[PDB]
Amino acid sequence: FFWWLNPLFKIGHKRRLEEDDMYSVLPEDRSQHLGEELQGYWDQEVLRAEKDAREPSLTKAIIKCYWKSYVVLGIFTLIEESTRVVQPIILGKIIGYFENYDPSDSAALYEAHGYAGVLSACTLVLAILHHLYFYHVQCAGMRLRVAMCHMIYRKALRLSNSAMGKTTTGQIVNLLSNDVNKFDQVTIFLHFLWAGPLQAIVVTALLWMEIGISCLAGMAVLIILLPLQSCIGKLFSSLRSKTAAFTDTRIRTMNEVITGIRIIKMYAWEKSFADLITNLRRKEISKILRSSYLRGMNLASFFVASKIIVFVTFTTYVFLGNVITASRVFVAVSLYGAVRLTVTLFFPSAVEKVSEAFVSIRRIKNFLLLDEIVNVQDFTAFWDKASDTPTLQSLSFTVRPGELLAVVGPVGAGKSSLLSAVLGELPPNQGQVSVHGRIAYVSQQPWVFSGTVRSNILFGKKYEKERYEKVIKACALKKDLQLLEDGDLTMIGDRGTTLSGGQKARVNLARAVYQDADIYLLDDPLSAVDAEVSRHLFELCICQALHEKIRILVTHQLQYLKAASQILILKDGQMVQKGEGKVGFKAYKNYFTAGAHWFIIIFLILVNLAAQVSYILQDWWLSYWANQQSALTEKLDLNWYLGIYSGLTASTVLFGIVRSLLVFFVLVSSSQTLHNQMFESILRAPVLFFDRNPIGRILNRFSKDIGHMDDLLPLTYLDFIQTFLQVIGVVGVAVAVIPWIAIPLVPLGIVFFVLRRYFLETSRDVKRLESTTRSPVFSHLSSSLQGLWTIRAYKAEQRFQELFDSHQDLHSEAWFLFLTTSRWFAVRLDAICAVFVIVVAFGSLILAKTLDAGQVGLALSYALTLMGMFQWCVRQSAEVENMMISVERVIEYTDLEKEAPWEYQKRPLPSWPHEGVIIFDNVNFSYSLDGPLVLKHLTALIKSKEKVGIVGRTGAGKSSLIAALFRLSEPEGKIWIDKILTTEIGLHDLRKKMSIIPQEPVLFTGTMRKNLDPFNEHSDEELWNALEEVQLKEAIEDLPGKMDTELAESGSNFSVGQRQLVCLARAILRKNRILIIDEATANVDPRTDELIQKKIREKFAHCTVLTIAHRLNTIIDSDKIMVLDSGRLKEYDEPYVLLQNRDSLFYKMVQQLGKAEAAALTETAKQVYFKRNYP
C-alpha cells in the first residue's frame, strides 16, 4: 500500500518537489554492486563458450544471472490467475439467487449476501496481487537495465583504438539511449507465456461444465488468433527495425543541416537538402504508416476478439438445441474475460517485447565482443596492418630527466603517432619501447568535462591553494578566472562549449600540471593561445618550471626549438634527422485539425461512438434474450434473435477495425503535415534564430518530438480512447439498469477528483525530476568516450566508473520514486473500484424486488471489469498530457518569422550581374533590430575587376560586411550591385551570383558529385577539369570510384588543406564575377596556403575580388584596402599610399609587425607600386 510515501505527497502539496526529496534505493540495488553480478556470469560464459569452441550467448549469462529471483514471482501469477477463474463461478451463484428468486426466503437472502462477501473478497485479493506482481516485475526490469549500462560503460572504457574505427561515438551512445530501454519491457510479461496457455486449459474445463461441447468453438477461434497475433508481432518488429536505418540517416542529415545552416544559406543549396530530407521522410513515413496499421490491427484484435469468441460459442450452442439462461451466459462471458486478457494482450505483448529485446541483445553482444627513462629502439608500427606503409619506421630515441625533446614535422608525419607509441597505444611491430615514471598526456584536442573548472584541474587530486594558484598563474589562467563571475566554480558544459578553445586547452594543460607527473607528453599545447601567451607559457612553465622533468614536445613553433635539448624531425613516418507544464484546448484542436478536413474528424467521432454502443448493445442483447427466454411447447424464433445478434456483432467487428485504423491515419497525417511545415519554417528562418538557440535545442524537436508524434503518441491516444469509452460504458450500464446508484456515485466522484488532483500536483514534479536526472548519464558517457585516451592514460578509470554509477543510481532513485508513486495512486483507484463493485453487488441485493436476472447479470458482468481498466485509463491520461508538451514544442516552431521571399516578382536579367560593380551608400548594419549598430555611415564604390580587401580590429564589422552583401539581416542605407538595389532583388537572385570561400570548410555526407554539384548542372568532364585545376585528381582517383564515390562521414578522410581545396573547387566551378574571400583559418599547412593564394590570383584574375584578411600579406597585392574601426570605415586607399601616410591606421598597424617585416613590406610595396605605376 506504499504508505511510506504519504508524507512525501503532503510535502509535494505544501511545496514543489525537488531532487533532494526522493527516498534512496536499497544498498542492494547500488549500480556498482548490481553490474558486477552480471559481469561475473558473462566472464564465466565467455570461458565456457571458449572451451566449447563456440560463440558465447549473452542470453545465457542473463538467465544464469537473474533466473533464481524472477521465477519466484510466478507465485503471484498463479494466485492472481486462480482468483480470476474462481470469481466468475461465485458470480454464477449470485445470479442464481435472482433466477430462482422469491421475496419470502430469508435463508436464500442470507446465502446471497454470503456470496456477495466472497465476491467482494476475491476482488480485493485480486487487486492487491495484481499490484504486488506488476510492481515487482517492473523492479526486476529496472535492475536488468542498470546492470546492462554498467557493463556497457565498463567495456567502453577499455576499447581498442582500431575498434573505434568500426563503431562511432554516437552509435555507442545510442545503445544506452535507445537499445537498453527495451529491457524494462521484457521482464513485465514473461510469466504470462506459461500462465496464459495454462489458464486457457483450466477455463476450457470449466466451460465444458457450464455449457458443454460448445466450449471448443470459442477456444478454436483463440487458437486461430494466438498464431496470428504472434505472426503480426514478428512482422511488426521486422518493419520497425528497418525504419531505424531511414530515421538515423534523416537525423544525421538534420544534424549537418542545422550545424551548417549559415553556409547552406550562403550557397543557396536549400533546395538540395529540402528534396533530400523530403525523400527520406517520404520513405520513412511509408514504413511508419505500414508499421502503425499492423499495430492498430493488434489493438483492434484485443478489443474485438472477446466478442468474436463469445459469438461463435453461443452460435453453436443454440444450433445444438439448447436454450439460453442468464447464469450460463454471464458465467461464460465472464470467464472469457480472463483468457482474453492474458492470452490476447500479454502473450502477444510478451512475444513482441521479447522479440524486440533480442534486437538489443544482438547489438550489445556485438559491442561487448569488440577488441580491447623513456627509450625507443628500432620501433616500427602500423595503426592498421592493412596499410601499405608503416606509420612509424626504424624509430630509435631516448630521453632522460631534464631533457626537452622537440618533435617536429608535417601534419601526419607521425608526431602524435610517436606520442601514441610512448603512450603504448601504438604497439611495436618491430623494435621496443620502455618507459619508467608517470606519464602526463596532453591530447591535441583539449578534453574538458562537465563540472567546475577546478574539478577539471584537480581531477581527483587534493585541493591545495599554493600549488593550485601556482598552476593557475603558471598556466596563465588567473586573469580569466578573475573575469569569470563565479570564478573557478563556474559551471562548464558537456564539452566546454561555454568555454573558448584556448580556455579549454589551458584548463586541460593546467590539469596535466596539477598531477605533478614525471613524463610530460606535450602535444602542440601552445597553438590555441596568442603569441604573447604562447611564449609566456613556454618560457615560464615549459622552460623554467617543468625543467626537472622529461618533456617530449610535438610543436610547429620553431621559435622555441632553440631551447630544446634535442630535436627529432619526422617525415613520411620515419626519422629524418635527430639533434511548459500545461497545455490548452487550442493545442489539441490544432493537432487534430492539421491532419484532416473537419469531415474526417467528425466522422471519426461517430465511428468511435458507434463502435462502443454496438459493443455495449451486444451484451445487452444477450441479457434481453435471456429475459425473454426466461419469460416463456413454444420457443423463440432464432432467425429473429440469432439474426439481430449477428448484426450487432458484425457492426462491432467492423467499426472496431475502422476505428483503430482511422486514428492512426489521422494522427500520422497530422505528424506528416507538421513535420513539413516545421521544416519549411526552419529553412526560411533567419540566421539570427540560429544564434539565439544552441544546435541541440533545435535538433531535439526533430529527433525526439517528431519521434513521439510518429511512433508513440498515436498509439497512446488509441489506447486511452478504447479504454475510456469502455469506462463510460461500465458506469452507464450500471446507472441505466439500477439508477439509485447515481447517489453513491456522487460522493465517490468527488473523492475521485480530489484524489486525482492531489496526485497530479506531484506527478508533474516526478516526471520532470526523472527526465532531468536521465540526461546527465548520456552526458557523462559522451564526455568519457571523448576523453577515452586521457582518462586511460592517467589510470583514472576506476573513478570514472564510480561516477557513472553515481549518475546511474541517482536516476534509479528518480525512477524508483516514479514507480512507487504510480502504484500508490493505482492502488487507491482500485480501492475506489472495489467500492463501486461492492455498491453494485450489495445494492442489487437490497433492491432485489425490482431487478431481474438478465439485468443483474449485465450490471455485474460489467462492474467486475472496472478494476484493471479504470486504474489504467487515468494513468494513460497523465501520459497524453505529458507528450502534448512535444506537440506544443513543434507547433511553436511552425510559425517562426520568415526571411523575405526567395524571389520577388521583380527579377534581374539572366545576364545580370554584367559588370560586377558594387556601391555602398551611407549603410548601417546590426545582427538584430534590438542590437547596437555594428557598422555605420559607410559609403564606398567597387569597380569592375578590381582587387580589394578589408582590415581592422576585431568586431569592427569584418564578418558584418559579408553578412550585409548576402542580406543575412537586412541593411540600413543602400547597396547597389551592377546599378540595381540589393533590397529589390530576391535572396535567390542575390546570394547566388556571388562567391564566398568560408573560413572553415564543410564537407557534407554523400558523393563527391553532390559535394561539388548538387544540381548536376556541370558537365561530366568539367569536374575533372576543375579537380585538375586544384590538382586533387591524383588523390581522389584512388577512391573506389573515380567519381560518384562515397565520401567518408563528414569527409573525415580528407585533411584540412584538402578540405579547403574542395571549397576552392566549388569556387572554380561556378562562374560568377564577384568573389569575397573569408579569413584564413588556424593550423593550415604552410605550403598549400601559398598554392591557394597563387591559384586564386592566377585563375580569378578576371573577377571582382573582395577579401577579409586574417594576415595582411594575404592581400598586399590588392589595388585598394578598406580599414574599419569601431564599426566605421576609417580608410579606403591603396596599401602603398597608406604606408606612405605614416599617420594612417594601416601604417599604425604595419608598424607593429616589427622593423624587419616593416622594411620588407616597405620595399615590396615600393616595388609593386612601381609595377602598377609603369602602365
Ligand SMILES: CCCCC[C@H](O)/C=C/[C@H]1[C@H](O)CC(=O)[C@@H]1CCCCCCC(=O)O
Ligand atoms: C498493456 C498494453 C496496453 C493494453 C491496452 C488495452 O486497451 C487494454 C487495457 C486494459 C484492459 O481493458 C483490461 C486491463 O487489465 C488492461 C490494463 C492493464 C494493462 C497492463 C498494465 C497493468 C498496470 O500497470 O496496472
